[PDB]
C-alpha cells in the first residue's frame, strides 16, 4: 500500500519474471512446480522439507498479493533453495541447478532499492 512497498514488489515481480525466463530454463525448470513427491518416489521428502516452496507458488502468492514487502518474497525464494540444499546430496544435479538459479536471484535481488 505504501509506495515504498509497492515499488519493492514491482522489483520482485520483475525478479520473478527473470528467473522464469527461457534464458534460465535449463536450470530453473525443476523449480517451476512443487516437487512431485509421489510421482518421483521421494518417500522422506516431507519429513526433511517441512515447508515446500516453488516458483509457481511464489508467482501465485505474488499474484494474490500475499507478500507484505520484498523480504517476505525473498524468504520464499530462499526457502525454495534451502529445501533443495537440505534434501539432496550436494553433487546431485538439481543442487547445481539450484545454486545457479540462486545466483541469478541474489544478483538481481541485491539491486533492490535501499
The number of angstroms, rounded, from the C-alpha of 4 to the middle of its chain's C-alpha atoms is 23
Which residue bears the cell 519493492? Answer: 8
Which one of 7, 33, 46, 103 is in contact with ligand BMF (CB under 6 A)?
A: 33
Among 27, 67, 87, 105, binds ligand BMF (CB under 6 A): 87
Judged by CB under 6 A, how many residues of this single chain contact ligand BMF? 11
Q: Which of residues 36-55 bind ligand BMF (CB under 6 A)?
A: 36, 40
Q: How far is the CB of 40 from ligand BMF (least distance, A)?
A: 6
Q: What are phi and psi of 92, to 5 degrees?
A: -70, 140
Do the beta carbons of residue 81 and residue 75 sit within 8 Å? no
Cα gap 52→65, rounded to integer Å: 19
Binding flag, residue 92, ligand BMF (CB under 6 A): yes
- Contact between 94 and ligand BMF per CB under 6 A: yes
58, 76 in Cβ contact below 8 A?
yes
Q: Which is nearer to ligand BMF, 37 or 112 (CB)?
A: 37
Residues 6+ apart with CB under 8 A from 37: 43, 45, 46
CB of 104 to ligand BMF, least distance (A): 15
Question: By the criterion CB under 6 A, which residues form the site for ligand BMF?
Answer: 30-31, 33, 35-36, 40, 84, 87-88, 92, 94
Amino acid at each position: 500500500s505504501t509506495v515504498k512497498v509497492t515499488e519493492q514488489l514491482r522489483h520482485c515481480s520483475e525478479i520473478l519474471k527473470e528467473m522464469l525466463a527461457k534464458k534460465h530454463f535449463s536450470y530453473a525448470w525443476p523449480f517451476y512446480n512443487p516437487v512431485d513427491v509421489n510421482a518421483l518416489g521421494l518417500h522422506n521428502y516431507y519429513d526433511v522439507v517441512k515447508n515446500p516452496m516453488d516458483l509457481g507458488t511464489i508467482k501465485e502468492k505474488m499474484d494474490n498479493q500475499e507478500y507484505k514487502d520484498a523480504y517476505k518474497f525473498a524468504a520464499d525464494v530462499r526457502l525454495m533453495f534451502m529445501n533443495c540444499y537440505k534434501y539432496n546430496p550436494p553433487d546431485h544435479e538439481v543442487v547445481t541447478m539450484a545454486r545457479m538459479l540462486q545466483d541469478v536471484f541474489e544478483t538481481h535481488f541485491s539491486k533492490i532499492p535501499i
